[PDB]
Design an enzyme around this catalytic site. Structure first.
Site, PDB file in Angstrom:
ATOM      1  N   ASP A 165      -0.673  16.227  34.835  1.00  0.00           N
ATOM      2  CA  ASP A 165      -0.970  17.074  36.019  1.00  0.00           C
ATOM      3  C   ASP A 165       0.160  18.071  36.211  1.00  0.00           C
ATOM      4  O   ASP A 165      -0.085  19.226  36.522  1.00  0.00           O
ATOM      5  CB  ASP A 165      -1.180  16.220  37.267  1.00  0.00           C
ATOM      6  N   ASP A 177       0.180  17.048  14.257  1.00  0.00           N
ATOM      7  CA  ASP A 177       0.435  16.918  12.789  1.00  0.00           C
ATOM      8  C   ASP A 177      -0.871  16.741  12.010  1.00  0.00           C
ATOM      9  O   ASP A 177      -0.905  15.954  11.050  1.00  0.00           O
ATOM     10  CB  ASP A 177       1.443  15.799  12.507  1.00  0.00           C
ATOM     11  N   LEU A 226       0.852  -1.228   0.000  1.00  0.00           N
ATOM     12  CA  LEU A 226       0.000   0.000   0.000  1.00  0.00           C
ATOM     13  C   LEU A 226       0.878   1.266   0.000  1.00  0.00           C
ATOM     14  O   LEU A 226       0.369   2.322  -0.400  1.00  0.00           O
ATOM     15  CB  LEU A 226      -0.893   0.016   1.244  1.00  0.00           C
ATOM     16  N   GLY A 227       2.128   1.180   0.478  1.00  0.00           N
ATOM     17  CA  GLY A 227       3.014   2.340   0.709  1.00  0.00           C
ATOM     18  C   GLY A 227       4.468   1.917   0.818  1.00  0.00           C
ATOM     19  O   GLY A 227       4.705   0.702   0.961  1.00  0.00           O
ATOM     20  N   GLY A 239       7.569   4.198   6.663  1.00  0.00           N
ATOM     21  CA  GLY A 239       8.012   2.824   6.350  1.00  0.00           C
ATOM     22  C   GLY A 239       7.153   2.164   5.279  1.00  0.00           C
ATOM     23  O   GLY A 239       6.420   2.891   4.553  1.00  0.00           O
ATOM     24  N   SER A 240       7.240   0.826   5.191  1.00  0.00           N
ATOM     25  CA  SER A 240       6.623  -0.035   4.140  1.00  0.00           C
ATOM     26  C   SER A 240       5.352  -0.704   4.678  1.00  0.00           C
ATOM     27  O   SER A 240       5.463  -1.421   5.667  1.00  0.00           O
ATOM     28  CB  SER A 240       7.620  -1.042   3.674  1.00  0.00           C
ATOM     29  N   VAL A 241       4.207  -0.494   4.019  1.00  0.00           N
ATOM     30  CA  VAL A 241       2.847  -0.871   4.512  1.00  0.00           C
ATOM     31  C   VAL A 241       2.208  -1.852   3.519  1.00  0.00           C
ATOM     32  O   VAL A 241       2.306  -1.609   2.304  1.00  0.00           O
ATOM     33  CB  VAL A 241       1.976   0.379   4.726  1.00  0.00           C
TER      34      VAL A 241
HETATM   35  C1  LIG Z   1       2.209   8.779  -4.741  1.00  0.00           C
HETATM   36  O1  LIG Z   1       2.037   9.403  -3.437  1.00  0.00           O
HETATM   37  C2  LIG Z   1       2.231   8.527  -2.295  1.00  0.00           C
HETATM   38  C3  LIG Z   1       1.182   7.414  -2.287  1.00  0.00           C
HETATM   39  N1  LIG Z   1       0.288   7.506  -1.113  1.00  0.00           N
HETATM   40  C4  LIG Z   1       0.307   6.553  -0.183  1.00  0.00           C
HETATM   41  O2  LIG Z   1       1.095   5.618  -0.284  1.00  0.00           O
HETATM   42  N2  LIG Z   1      -0.589   6.668   0.804  1.00  0.00           N
HETATM   43  C5  LIG Z   1      -0.690   5.878   1.881  1.00  0.00           C
HETATM   44  C6  LIG Z   1      -1.695   6.192   2.795  1.00  0.00           C
HETATM   45  C7  LIG Z   1      -1.849   5.432   3.942  1.00  0.00           C
HETATM   46  F1  LIG Z   1      -2.820   5.738   4.788  1.00  0.00           F
HETATM   47  C8  LIG Z   1      -1.010   4.358   4.223  1.00  0.00           C
HETATM   48  O3  LIG Z   1      -1.142   3.636   5.386  1.00  0.00           O
HETATM   49  C9  LIG Z   1      -2.312   2.949   5.573  1.00  0.00           C
HETATM   50  C10 LIG Z   1      -3.108   2.553   4.499  1.00  0.00           C
HETATM   51  C11 LIG Z   1      -4.301   1.881   4.738  1.00  0.00           C
HETATM   52  N3  LIG Z   1      -4.699   1.588   5.959  1.00  0.00           N
HETATM   53  C12 LIG Z   1      -3.943   1.940   7.007  1.00  0.00           C
HETATM   54  N4  LIG Z   1      -4.123   1.774   8.311  1.00  0.00           N
HETATM   55  C13 LIG Z   1      -3.138   2.288   8.978  1.00  0.00           C
HETATM   56  C14 LIG Z   1      -2.264   2.833   8.156  1.00  0.00           C
HETATM   57  C15 LIG Z   1      -1.083   3.466   8.581  1.00  0.00           C
HETATM   58  C16 LIG Z   1       0.164   3.437   8.060  1.00  0.00           C
HETATM   59  N5  LIG Z   1       1.099   4.133   8.751  1.00  0.00           N
HETATM   60  C17 LIG Z   1       0.646   4.714   9.884  1.00  0.00           C
HETATM   61  S1  LIG Z   1      -1.040   4.388  10.038  1.00  0.00           S
HETATM   62  C18 LIG Z   1      -2.739   2.632   6.858  1.00  0.00           C
HETATM   63  C19 LIG Z   1       0.013   4.056   3.321  1.00  0.00           C
HETATM   64  F2  LIG Z   1       0.844   3.021   3.571  1.00  0.00           F
HETATM   65  C20 LIG Z   1       0.178   4.816   2.158  1.00  0.00           C
END
Ligand SMILES: COCCNC(=O)Nc1cc(F)c(Oc2ccnc3[nH]cc(-c4cncs4)c23)c(F)c1
Length: 273
Positions: free
Chosen positions: A151, A124, A14-15, A17-19
């Protein structure tokens, strides 16, 4: 106590770090797994997990637990399949309508009301840190710079956040509290309406110098926006933190109070995925 690969079937990245998207094999539940090397810098990973573990809100991304696999840390979290609001703006190459923004910011404000009650400051808030699940429910994510009041410590004073979104009192040496997030929320409202925050085209270290001295920002094209949306942004971007509206009070603002249900985000989400 079980091996992560026996509990989870890892699917698509998905992304990066690496997701990864993954299936919890015992329930069929979809989760997101962030994988980082154990030898990497874990400072904000440790911070963000400590904060998420303390939260139980439908408006805050859930943390489910962590595994070692080989020499990686696997961080298991709630899956938000539509990605970030900034992803959805980029993918559709379109800014959000007032109605779409009101619905997202109503759920964002419920998340802020919950955090602020728990004496947490996100610090943020931005369109990139608001995630939508496939049903259109907005959740706060990336707690890597979140602060905790106590506190003995009623104020934080760390200059931290992402410059364009940072409150004037956060940039200035003076201490600050939960309503710094309300300023960031106002910038986020403009970012969702215009695609980028005020000062997006100037050097971030120049912008941080001007935010404390400049008047509150306004819409680039004020004629496009309702009196309710205009007033909502004005209330968020009150420079005096003592005077600034709370999350609870902004949930009653006419812009937010009559937001449509998550159905208004169905078209939006479908198009993005
Ligand atoms: C080209 O431009 C960059 C591409 N955009 C991108 O990669 N977006 C992204 C958004 C997210 F929300 C991503 O992470 C998630 C995704 C789904 N469901 C989640 N649930 C929790 C996450 C999180 C993960 N990192 C902290 S929370 C998460 C991610 F990996 C990538």
């Amino acid at each position: 106590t079980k091996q992560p690969e026996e509990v989870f079937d890892v699917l698509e990245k998905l992304g990066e770090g690496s997701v990864y998207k993954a299936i919890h094999k015992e329930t069929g539940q979809i989760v997101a797994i962030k994988q980082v090397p154990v030898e990497s810098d874990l400072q904000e990973i440790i911070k963000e997990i400590s904060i998420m573990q303390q939260c139980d809100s439908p408006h805050v991304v859930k943390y489910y637990g962590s595994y070692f696999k080989n020499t990686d840390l696997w961080i298991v979290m709630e899956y938000c399949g539509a990605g970030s609001v900034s992803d959805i703006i980029r993918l559709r190459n379109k800014t959000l309508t007032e109605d779409e923004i009101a619905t997202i910011l109503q759920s964002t404000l419920k998340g802020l009301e919950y955090l602020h009650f728990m004496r947490k400051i996100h610090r943020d808030i931005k369109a990139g840190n608001i995630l939508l699940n496939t049903e259109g429910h907005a959740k706060l994510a990336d707690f890597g710079v979140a602060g905790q009041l106590t506190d003995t410590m009623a104020k934080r004073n760390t200059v931290i956040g992402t410059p364009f979104w940072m409150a004037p009192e956060v940039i200035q040496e003076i201490g600050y509290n939960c309503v710094a997030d309300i300023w960031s929320l106002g910038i986020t409202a403009i970012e969702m309406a215009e695609g980028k925050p005020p000062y997006a085209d100037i050097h971030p270290m120049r912008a941080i110098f001007m935010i404390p001295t400049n008047p509150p920002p306004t819409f680039r094209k004020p004629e496009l926006w309702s009196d309710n949306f205009t007033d909502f942004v004005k209330q968020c971007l009150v420079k005096s933190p003592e005077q600034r509206a709370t999350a609870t009070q902004l949930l009653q603002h006419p812009f937010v109070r009559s937001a449509k249900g998550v159905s208004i985000l169905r078209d939006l989400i479908n198009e993005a995925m």
